[PDB]
Design a protein around this nucleic acid. Structure first.
Lengths: 62, 62
DNA sequence: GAATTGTGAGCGGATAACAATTT
DNA sequence: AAATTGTTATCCGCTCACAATTC
């Protein structure tokens, strides 16, 4: 109930939603500054991956 | 687990993914000929209808 | 015109690459 | 050149629309 998208995390962090995909997967081209902000945002919004959209798009991850 | 998609069923029945979805949904534009072929094909590969994808495809609502 | 069947695009989301800027 | 950040395009099982064919 009331999930959190990777979009919410980006919006709060003040970065592009792709910046999250980066920290989540391609840590490359991701400075510690931005990385730390995204990681912290995951707790702020209480990031709960879109079980429907993620499983669909190709990111079930258990 | 093998997440069989409507494409896998359509490929087995020799139909379209739209046809498969029409059979799974049981709404309109579906003939009994293809319906019984899709229900049979989805039984071979053990197709699991994704309700999450359905919610998304039909515009994720609250 | 509607139904049937197939193809294309979108839903809302994510992933990857490219261009520009900084170091 | 490499790293960093933002942006565009494509992909995902499913649904809708469009196109073609048949009724």
């Amino acid at each position: 109930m009331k999930p959190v998208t990777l979009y919410d995390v980006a919006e709060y962090a003040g970065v592009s939603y792709q910046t999250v995909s980066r920290v989540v997967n391609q840590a490359s081209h991701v400075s510690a500054k931005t990385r730390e902000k995204v990681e912290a945002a995951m707790a702020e919004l209480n990031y709960i991956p879109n079980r429907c959209a993620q499983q669909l798009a190709g990111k079930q991850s258990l």
